[PDB]
Amino acid sequence: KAKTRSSRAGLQFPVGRVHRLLRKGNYAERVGAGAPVYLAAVLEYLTAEILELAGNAARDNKKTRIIPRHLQLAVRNDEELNKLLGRVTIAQGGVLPNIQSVLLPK
Amino acid sequence: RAKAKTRSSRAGLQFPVGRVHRLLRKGNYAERVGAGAPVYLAAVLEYLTAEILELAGNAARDNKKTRIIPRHLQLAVRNDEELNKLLGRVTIAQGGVLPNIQSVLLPKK
Amino acid sequence: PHRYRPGTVALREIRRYQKSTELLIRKLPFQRLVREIAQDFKTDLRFQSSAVMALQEASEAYLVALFEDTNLCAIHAKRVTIMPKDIQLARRIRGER
Amino acid sequence: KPHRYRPGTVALREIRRYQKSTELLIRKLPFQRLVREIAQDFKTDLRFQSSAVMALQEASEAYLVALFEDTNLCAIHAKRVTIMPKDIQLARRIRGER
Amino acid sequence: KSRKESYAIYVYKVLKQVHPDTGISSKAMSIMNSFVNDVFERIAGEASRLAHYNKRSTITSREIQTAVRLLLPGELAKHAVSEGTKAVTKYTSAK
Amino acid sequence: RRKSRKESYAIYVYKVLKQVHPDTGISSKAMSIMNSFVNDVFERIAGEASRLAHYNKRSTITSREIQTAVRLLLPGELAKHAVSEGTKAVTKYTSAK
Amino acid sequence: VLRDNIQGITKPAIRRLARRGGVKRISGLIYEETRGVLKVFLENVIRDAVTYTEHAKRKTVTAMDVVYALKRQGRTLYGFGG
Amino acid sequence: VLRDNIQGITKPAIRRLARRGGVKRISGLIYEETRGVLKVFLENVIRDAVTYTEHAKRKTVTAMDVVYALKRQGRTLYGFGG
DNA sequence: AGCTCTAGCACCGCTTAAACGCACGTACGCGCTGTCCCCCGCGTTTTAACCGCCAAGGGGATTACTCCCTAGTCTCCAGGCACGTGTCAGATATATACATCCGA
DNA sequence: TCGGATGTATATATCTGACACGTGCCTGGAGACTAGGGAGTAATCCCCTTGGCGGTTAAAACGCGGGGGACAGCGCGTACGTGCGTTTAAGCGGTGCTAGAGCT
């Protein structure tokens, strides 16, 4: 019986695919076996964080399907995923609802 | 054995194609490096070096100096509109800044 | 008859367009502009339908972001009307000019 | 009565002097202590190459000088001669630093 | 090749683990896949620089951990390092 | 002990200086900047040449990748001259042994 | 040959973009300045995109070509491929 | 041991930097704003520099660590190697 | 080099709602003014930055040795990915609450 | 003040095409074994960072006068917003094709 490296680490992201991409990407002459495991975990964790905040935004909008609007709202409302994705444009994401108080009526 | 002649001298370049070739390989930029790749790259680097040194030498003469110093390099890189675009994100050590004052700050009669 | 005063609907339009995700520029006119520019680099180029949309998404996002920077510098001059000098200052402080 | 230059005259002379020369404007020791103070908060007993402190100073002075140019522009844009904190805050906000 | 590899299945499995009641549009999924690929390239890209700067020839957990400490903001980094170290610990301990 | 050899573009920058300005010299500090500049531009073109090969999933970096990388990274007139210089160097080199 | 299509980007479209950007009031000159700015922006992105197309020896600009151009210019776009 | 050295960067030092930046008149409030901005700038660069030092398991921060930190931060410094 | 057959390009026809030109008001640009304050310019005071020389030790660089870790290859098999499918989430349509703005 | 206008938000129902589910299968991961050198260890060295003393002398700090500019307040006008009638062409549906991306 063969047990996939993803299940050994308790991860969903494919360690094998991450290992193959690390090797095929020519990022270095060699790739330690711990590197794809560690990287897959970081990517899987960051994926959950985005999806978690996006899911909350969806529930707040009484929606149960994540759409680009929820991703943008989550990314821009999160004080640190915005720092990670400050240079990133999200298709159909739009912008955060924001009006400067100087523009509002007295 | 034929007399060894450097690829740079064959290409009529001062920059070492061999060194550029070794770095293109040692840096693992790709699995393989075509023999023409380091020649083309060395020529571009040699040209860009001449471009900055020419303007820097002019700035040195304009400053009545014979040795190029970082000030001359900054004045050259910043006075040229294209070099300032290529090196806009680049800071030059001890280069200072261009001697420009906003006209609105100058006194008026 | 009833009429909304100047800026009343503008505040409503802001909410409408901030609440909406769709592209604000007409798709076909933007595609024509892309072609007009692209043809200068190479004749009879072809564009994937998704490539034109990618250009529009980026162009609208860039302009919207620029208008925010424009608005912020307009507010800094204690003005509410954005002027070309606001765009010029924003583009200058952003480092793209 | 003693000779006195008009307000801003010496400022213009100072601008020329500091723009013409390439001397570093921050004292090395106060900046070096500042670097080690900030560094001591990230990892204890770190050591700094003399050139490493200088590299940080050149970047820091270039960053602040560039920021002051952008700050002067937004101050001038507000039709003001005196730069205010809101000018720096706007420059940083437009620069995407906030 | 004709077959295209995407994180769709894994993003969906993570979504199921996060919010089983919640779905995700194909457009949002495309964004997520592009985000995962971009973050992968950033970490692997920085990991290559770290190895080269030390003239090292292999990417290890230390390079990934350091790249994550450099690219991720502080709390994302601390939590991602905890997740990465936990996953490597379980993997190595499970043997 | 003896210091292990550190490579530098110093002598090549100097030979180019002697060409553009035989009477002009260059301080060690300015030379260090020029060396940093050469290395930075090298890494930028090489980094883009890698992406180009990778985007087409090619295994070899050739003159085509370098020429395209130069056109992308360098500004308009610098690119035109650099492409001309790179082409002239490569074409004449091909005529050699 | 298509020409003078920049004026085809309607005045309300520029207004809508400004409204989304939070602009309450728009000067009559913003429309020409925005078209010029957009013209420069699209020129830079299309120049690089076409350059990738030409290097690939292709005649059709793929959406990935635009993403690479945007990626090179530090404005990476998510949603059109990885 | 070390404390408050951000206040040791003198008011004239900030003035000189502003004068080189072409600023003709400087409000007294700029000094504290500048120290705060300078502090966060140095913190970001030093954090990355120390991270390179730590990954190399070294105890002294080299000029290369600073140059790589700056390069990663998006601002390249010429004249210190690399 | 060769084939495939994708989908990009082109056009017609109809729809309609966005775009436009124009009417006309008053919101807001900003010239002008007042004024007071706070920043400048200078002298005085002073302090710690700087220079320079010496300690010393540690940690960085180097050599030598090792070994255990990864790349390559092979076998294998079931995970993952196009095809198939359908059912139910939100678009569309309708009713209708409820806050905000305007005209008096 | 304030009530009326009135757009936006919310609640309900029908629908539907999109994604959630199922399947076939095959290829790339997993298991196995190897070589061998990169990384890790240990010993060494020395240099360069930290640390101290001395002093001086330039630079910083401190006070002050005062002036000019920050900007509150004002005037005021025209530019820009809103509304309307007009019409424009974008968008959609459909049909044609074939360059040229994709694969071998």
Swiss-Prot record, chain A:
Asked if DNA-binding is a keyword of the record, the answer is yes
Q: Which residues carry this modification: N6-glutaryllysine?
A: K83, K106
* Disulfide bond residue pairs: none
Mainly resides where? nucleus
**Signal sequence, start to end:** none
PTM annotation (N5-methylglutamine): residues: Q92
Q: Which residues carry this modification: N6-(2-hydroxyisobutyryl)lysine?
A: K24, K62, K63, K83, K106
Q: Does the keyword Acetylation apply?
A: yes
What are the alphabetically sorted keywords of the record?
Answer: Acetylation, Chromosome, DNA-binding, Hydroxylation, Isopeptide bond, Methylation, Nucleosome core, Nucleus, Phosphoprotein, Ubl conjugation
* Function, as annotated: Core component of nucleosome. Nucleosomes wrap and compact DNA into chromatin, limiting DNA accessibility to the cellular machineries which require DNA as a template. Histones thereby play a central role in transcription regulation, DNA repair, DNA replication and chromosomal stability. DNA accessibility is regulated via a complex set of post-translational modifications of histones, also called histone code, and nucleosome remodeling.
- Describe its partners and assembly state: The nucleosome is a histone octamer containing two molecules each of H2A, H2B, H3 and H4 assembled in one H3-H4 heterotetramer and two H2A-H2B heterodimers. The octamer wraps approximately 147 bp of DNA.
Q: What is the recorded name of this protein?
A: Histone H2A type 1
Source organism per entry reads Xenopus laevis (African clawed frog)
Shown part of the complete sequence: 14 to 119 of 130
UniProtKB/Swiss-Prot annotation, chain C:
Its keywords, alphabetically, are:
Acetylation, ADP-ribosylation, Chromosome, Citrullination, DNA-binding, Hydroxylation, Lipoprotein, Methylation, Nucleosome core, Nucleus, Palmitate, Phosphoprotein, Ubl conjugation
**Covalent lipidation (S-palmitoyl cysteine), chain numbering:** C73
In-chain residues carrying the UniProt-annotated modification N6-succinyllysine:
K19, K42, K85
Phosphotyrosine-modified residues are: Y4
Modified residue annotations for N6-glutaryllysine? K19, K42, K78, K85
Q: Which residues carry this modification: N6-lactoyllysine?
A: K19, K42
List residues, modification N6,N6,N6-trimethyllysine: K19, K42
In-chain residues carrying the UniProt-annotated modification Phosphothreonine: T43, T70
Q: Which domain of life is it from?
A: Eukaryota
Q: How is it modified after translation?
A: Acetylation is generally linked to gene activation. Acetylation at Lys-85 (H3K122ac) by EP300/p300 plays a central role in chromatin structure: localizes at the surface of the histone octamer and stimulates transcription, possibly by promoting nucleosome instability. H3R2me2a is present at the 3' of genes regardless of their transcription state and is enriched on inactive promoters, while it is absent on active promoters.
Q: According to the UniProt record, list the residues that bear N6-(2-hydroxyisobutyryl)lysine.
A: K19, K27, K42, K85
Residues with the N6-crotonyllysine modification:
K19
In the record, N6-acetyllysine modifications are located at K19, K42, K78, K85
Q: Which residues carry this modification: N6,N6-dimethyllysine?
A: K42
Q: Where is the signal peptide?
A: none
The record's GO molecular-function terms, alphabetically, read:
DNA binding; protein heterodimerization activity; structural constituent of chromatin
N6-methyllysine modification sites are: K19, K27, K42, K85
Which Gene Ontology cellular component annotation is one that this UniProt entry carries?
A: nucleoplasm
Compartments annotated for it: namely: Nucleus; Chromosome
Note the subunit structure.
The nucleosome is a histone octamer containing two molecules each of H2A, H2B, H3 and H4 assembled in one H3-H4 heterotetramer and two H2A-H2B heterodimers. The octamer wraps approximately 147 bp of DNA.
Q: Which family does it belong to?
A: Belongs to the histone H3 family.
Stated name of the protein: Histone H3.2
Organism name: Xenopus laevis
* Residue range from the parent sequence: 39 to 135 of 136
Swiss-Prot record, chain F:
Record PTM: Monoubiquitination of Lys-92 by BRE1 gives a specific tag for epigenetic transcriptional activation and is also prerequisite for histone H3 'Lys-4' and 'Lys-79' methylation. GlcNAcylation at Ser-84 promotes monoubiquitination of Lys-92. It fluctuates in response to extracellular glucose, and associates with transcribed genes.
**What is the protein's major site of localization?**
nucleus
GO CC terms of this entry: nucleosome; nucleus
Location comes to: Nucleus; Chromosome
Identify the domain of life. Answer: Eukaryota
Which positions are linked by Glycyl lysine isopeptide (Lys-Gly) (interchain with G-Cter in ubiquitin)? Answer: K92
Keywords tagged on the record: Acetylation, Chromosome, DNA-binding, Glycoprotein, Isopeptide bond, Nucleosome core, Nucleus, Phosphoprotein, Ubl conjugation
Q: Give the glycosylated residues.
A: S84
Care to name a GO molecular-function term for this sequence? protein heterodimerization activity
The role this protein plays is: Core component of nucleosome. Nucleosomes wrap and compact DNA into chromatin, limiting DNA accessibility to the cellular machineries which require DNA as a template. Histones thereby play a central role in transcription regulation, DNA repair, DNA replication and chromosomal stability. DNA accessibility is regulated via a complex set of post-translational modifications of histones, also called histone code, and nucleosome remodeling.
> What does the subunit comment say?
The nucleosome is a histone octamer containing two molecules each of H2A, H2B, H3 and H4 assembled in one H3-H4 heterotetramer and two H2A-H2B heterodimers. The octamer wraps approximately 147 bp of DNA.
| Protein family | Belongs to the histone H2B family.
State what protein this is by name: Histone H2B 1.1
Curated annotation (Swiss-Prot), chains G, H:
Gene Ontology annotations of biological process type:
nucleosome assembly
Q: Which residues carry this modification: N6-butyryllysine?
A: K11, K24, K57, K59, K71
Put simply, this protein is called Histone H4
Cross-link Glycyl lysine isopeptide (Lys-Gly) (interchain with G-Cter in ubiquitin) position reads K71
Q: Which GO terms describe its molecular function?
A: DNA binding; protein heterodimerization activity; structural constituent of chromatin
Which residues are annotated with the PTM N6-glutaryllysine?
Answer: K11, K39, K57, K59, K71
**Residues included from the entire protein:** 22 to 103 of 103
Modified sites of kind N6-(2-hydroxyisobutyryl)lysine: K11, K24, K39, K57, K59, K71
- Sites where Phosphotyrosine occurs are at Y31, Y68
Q: Which family is it part of?
A: Belongs to the histone H4 family.
